């Protein structure tokens, strides 16, 4: 599909709130002023927050719950001057514009919303939140934003839910709209989610996907974002295996950790290794399978860098096809197998023992 | 000269900070409703009404009423068929769920709101249950041409007598700027059996306003 032509799309974090002020009353060519104004809303709950009386600009206002029709359904909408039209947060692709360029202002990029234009008015938010799990608390619903207004501002330790019906876009609605208000919120507040998860890593997958959407337009910000099962579990056997001050303590301090010391031994930790490999699809991804994604790792003013596999000269794909190659005359397999053979003699061992000769990239 | 957006967008990062403060400002508690404003006006907010309601109890039928019956046949004159047959319930009563009993409360006033509710609910399903009983014993005074408007004036005015004493309890406590989503949602459902109440009714029907016509506005619910 593709956004009908005339109409934009405004993004902000900040319409998770309603912006009463930002509209102004559309006019036809010919200044035909629309004071006449409908809008459209997930759900009639979202109508209880919005006030007549911000918009003394018009006389006439209603709101009504979005529904997707089917007979209307084109790829160019039905087009209704007579009254201006807004759609806030839509889920779903609209059938119906109102006077001249129609516009909406959501928090999220629907797959809907690709095609079309768009502004961001984007700005960082440093502060990246996290999750905790321990298995005092503040029950937090799943849904309605402010019911525990300014509790999000007063806690940091947040329990959430969801009802079993609840539509997955709605959930990652609410979600964003949280994770939003959190990056605004001066601490990071811990999320605690009463759920089976499975699907909530998928929703992350999705995440990746929306996250990626907006980058096509972005502000390109440092957003925090891990792999949340694999990963998880990984690092804590990690610290499991190490001593544990802290079995809450975040990844990103190993992370830095490892970070003090990676460019004086120039090469790459086991750890950041075992990342981009144990990820289902941003890794060497048994999605596929696909270890090709090496990584290639640069420092300010060097003039080498650090591939997966030793030191590589700039800009180039990661080894010659020639080279000082591993001429046979070493790794002969007789040679290999006598060094073999001396060696289990003199181990006494039986078996588990194989060895590899070394290769060679660009550099030796 | 300094052509690039950094300046602005530094005055944006600025700016952000307000954001939260702002909001928290225009999600605080408000001073007054004005619909319980309305209320106060409308009530003996015209001729003398006030007194004929020596009704109370919430919960009775044809107390006396048929002295005021006999001026409610001076008003056959006027076109009852103005009244609304309906009863807006929650169209009228959502202003009274503006109150986050948290706070300026003991936490016990939404259990009293919510027992006020089921109240007039039963007394709505009584209505239901006994109109055309409650039609013959006024008839008694006569048939009209809008004896069914009158009943259901009759009603909703006893009713009002009440809900403006009830009110008055409360006597314009502080509201949120917005209602309690249960209380808001049980008073949805509660309204739904209410509005399939007179679905039930299945009946059919059978200028100097300016003082009444206030009250009939009220009933229509009137902005």
């Known amino acids: 599909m593709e956004c009908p032509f005339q109409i934009q799309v405004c993004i ?34 979202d109508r209880l927050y919005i006030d007549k009386k911000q918009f003394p600009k018009f006389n006439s206002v209603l709101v009504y719950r979005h529904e ?57 938010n440093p502060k990246c939140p996290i999750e905790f799990t321990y298995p005092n608390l503040r029950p937090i619903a799943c849904e309605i934003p402010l019911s525990h207004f300014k509790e999000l501002v007063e806690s940091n330790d947040f329990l959430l839910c969801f009802n079993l019906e609840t539509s997955t876009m709605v959930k990652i609605l609410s979600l964003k709209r949280i994770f939003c208000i959190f990056q605004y919120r001066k601490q990071p507040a811990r999320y605690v989610i009463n759920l089976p998860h499975e699907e909530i890593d998928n929703l992350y997958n999705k995440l990746n996907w929306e996250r990626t959407r907006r980058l096509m337009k972005g502000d390109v910000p440092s957003n925090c974002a891990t792999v949340n099962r694999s990963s998880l ?70 003039s080498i860098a650090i591939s997966s596999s030793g030191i590589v ?12 190659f591993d001429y046979s005359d070493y790794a002969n397999r007789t040679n290999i197998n006598f060094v073999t053979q001396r ?21 030796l | 000269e300094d052509v690039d957006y950094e300046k602005e967008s530094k ?30 006006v409308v009530t003996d907010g015209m001729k003398r009404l006030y007194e004929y309601c020596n009704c ?50 003991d936490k016990t006033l939404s259990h009293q709101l919510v027992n006020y509710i089921f109240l007039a609910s039963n007394y709505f399903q009584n209505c239901a249950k006994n109109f055309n009983y409650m039609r013959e014993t006024f008839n008694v005074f006569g048939p009209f041409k809008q004896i069914d408007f009158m009943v259901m004036f009759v009603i909703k005015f006893n009713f009002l007598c009440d809900m403006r004493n009830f009110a008055k309890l409360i006597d314009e406590l502080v509201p949120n700027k ?8 049980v008073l949805v459902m509660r309204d739904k059996i209410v509005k399939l109440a007179f679905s039930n009714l299945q009946f059919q029907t059978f200028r100097n306003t300016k003082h009444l016509q206030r009250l009939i506005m009220l009933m229509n619910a009137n902005y």
């Open chain 1, 313 to 324: 000269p700039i800009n180039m794909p990661d080894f010659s096809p020639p080279n000082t």
């Open chain 1, 343 to 363: 060696v289990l003699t003199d181990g006494g061992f039986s078996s588990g023992i194989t060895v590899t000769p070394v290769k060679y990239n660009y550099y």
């Open chain 1, 68 to 124: 997707h029709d089917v007979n209307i359904d084109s790829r160019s909408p039905k087009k209704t001057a007579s009254a201006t039209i807004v759609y806030w947060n839509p889920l779903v692709p609209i059938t119906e514009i109102g006077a001249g360029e129609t516009r909406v202002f959501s928090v999220l990029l629907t797959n809907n919303l690709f095609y079309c234009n768009t502004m961001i008015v984007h700005h960082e």
């Open chain 1, 12 to 45: 902000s974090d900040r319409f998770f709130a309603f912006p009463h002020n930002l509209v102004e009353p559309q006019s036809d060519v010919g200044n035909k002023l629309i004071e006449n104004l409908i809008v459209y809303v997930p759900t009639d709950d």
């Open chain 2, 56 to 105: 109370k109890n919430s919960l009775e039928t044809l107390p006396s009423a048929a002295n005021y019956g006999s001026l409610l046949k001076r008003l056959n004159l006027y076109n009852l068929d103005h009244i609304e047959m309906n009863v807006n319930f929650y169209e009228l009563l959502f202003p009274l769920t503006l109150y986050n009993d948290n706070d300026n409360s």
């Open chain 2, 178 to 185: 917005q209602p309690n989503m249960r209380i808001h949602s």
């Open chain 2, 11 to 40: 005055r944006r990062k600025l700016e952000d900070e307000d954001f939260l403060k702002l909001k928290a400002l225009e999600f605080s508690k408000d001073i007054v409703n004005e619909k319980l404003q309305k209320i106060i």
């Open chain 1, 233 to 302: 579990k990984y690092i804590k056997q990690a610290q499991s295996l190490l001593g544990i001050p802290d079995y809450s303590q975040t990844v990103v301090d190993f992370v830095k950790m490892f970070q003090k010391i990676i460019f004086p031994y120039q090469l790459v930790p086991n750890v950041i290794i075992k990342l981009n490999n144990f990820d289902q699809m941003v890794s060497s991804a048994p999605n596929k399978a696909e270890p090709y994604k090496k990584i290639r790792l640069f420092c300010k003013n060097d």
